[PDB]
Design a protein around this ligand. Structure first.
Ligand SMILES: CCCCCCCCCCC(CCCCCCCCCC)(CO[C@H]1O[C@@H](CO)[C@H](O[C@@H]2O[C@@H](CO)[C@H](O)[C@@H](O)[C@@H]2O)[C@@H](O)[C@@H]1O)CO[C@H]1O[C@@H](CO)[C@H](O[C@@H]2O[C@@H](CO)[C@H](O)[C@@H](O)[C@@H]2O)[C@@H](O)[C@H]1O
Ligand SMILES: Nc1nc(NCCc2ccc(O)cc2)nc2nc(-c3ccco3)nn12
Length: 271
């Protein structure tokens, strides 16, 4: 119990620090203000909020505080909007890499800073609508005690939250990355191509780490929903899955530092 709170607080601190470093690095350095880096800083902002609010909210839900219904749904479902925003940002990054690699000549024409910010705003607005759907409808609410099992319907999680809003973007961007690397192999000028592949590899790792972290908890929810005859998953397994899902927030600043040389140099400059 106490171990969970301590590890969650440590994850929150690490996420805040790493992603504020990423945001500061992109803001400070003009060489790092690409089109893809706008999606990168949107994803960093999503991780910052995961650290600042989503993890304290998870701790409070673990304590099972009683409160009003709508506040309870907001506390339980704030992680959902941030995960969806991360999904949308990762998809935008994958499509940007595909545009940059498959059609380099018209890449600058197709994607523009104003277009990038627009897509970011639309994706952020859609993430709130998808994640906070329980507040509008689909409630098991009927001061209710805040338990994520009792309050948030599992039909929502296993159909709308997961099958349409995670697996579909996950599989689409898996196909996008496969097409990216197939086109990279077809195209092989050589110096520029290896920069695109290296950038695509870096942005595909942070995608692979996201799916690796989130599918444990999603599959546990699917097991809870599809087969009611079997008993509920153990509490320790549930907390481990939550911690694993939260761990994806801290990893990608380290990936940027390790893979992207400009990020590493400006990180060392900041510190
Ligand atoms: C939820 C979905 C999440 C997203 C999934 C995306 C999956 C994408 C798979 C892509 C990938 C695996 C490695 C990817 C990185 C790790 C990913 C996992 C990280 C987990 C933490 C296999 O991709 C191929 O895999 C084959 C099977 O092995 C398939 O067959 C192919 O269709 C597929 O494209 C890429 O492998 C390789 O692709 C090639 C270019 O093609 C890269 O460039 C090669 O070297 C360059 C000089 O260095 C040259 O300049 C370039 O000319 C040369 O070709 C390689 O360096 C390497 O990268
Ligand atoms: N299923 C589930 N449970 C929880 N917390 C409930 C933990 C619990 C589980 C069993 C129990 O008897 C008492 C408490 N948070 C959860 N977050 C998510 C989630 C976030 C994104 C997708 O699923 N699913 N999820």
């Amino acid at each position: 119990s106490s171990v969970y709170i301590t590890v969650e607080l440590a994850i929150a601190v690490l996420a805040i620090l790493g992603n504020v470093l990423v945001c500061w690095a992109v803001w400070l350095n003009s060489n790092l203000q690409n089109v893809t880096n706008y999606f990168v800083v949107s994803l960093a902002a999503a991780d910052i909020l995961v650290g600042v609010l989503a993890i304290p909210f998870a701790i409070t839900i673990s304590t099972g505080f009683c409160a009003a219904c709508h506040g309870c749904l907001f506390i339980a479902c704030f992680v959902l909007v941030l995960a969806q925003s991360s999904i949308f940002s990762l998809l935008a990054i994958a499509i940007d890499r595909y545009i940059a690699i498959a059609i380099p000549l018209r890449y600058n024409g197709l994607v523009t800073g104003t277009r990038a910010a627009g897509i970011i705003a639309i994706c952020w607005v859609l993430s709130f609508a998808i994640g906070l759907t329980p507040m509008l409808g689909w409630n098991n609410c009927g001061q209710v005690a805040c338990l994520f099992e009792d309050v948030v319907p599992m039909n929502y999680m296993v159909y709308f939250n997961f099958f349409a809003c995670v697996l579909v973007p996950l599989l689409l961007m898996l196909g996008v990355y496969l097409r990216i690397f197939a086109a990279a192999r077809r195209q092989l000028a050589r110096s520029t191509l290896q920069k695109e592949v290296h950038a695509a590899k870096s942005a595909a790792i942070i995608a692979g780490l996201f799916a690796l972290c989130w599918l444990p908890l999603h599959i546990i929810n699917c097991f809870t929903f599809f087969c009611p005859d079997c008993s509920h998953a153990p509490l320790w397994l549930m907390y481990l899955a939550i911690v694993l899902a939260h761990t994806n927030s801290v990893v990608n600043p380290f990936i940027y530092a390790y893979r992207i040389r400009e990020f590493r140099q400006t990180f060392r400059k900041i510190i």
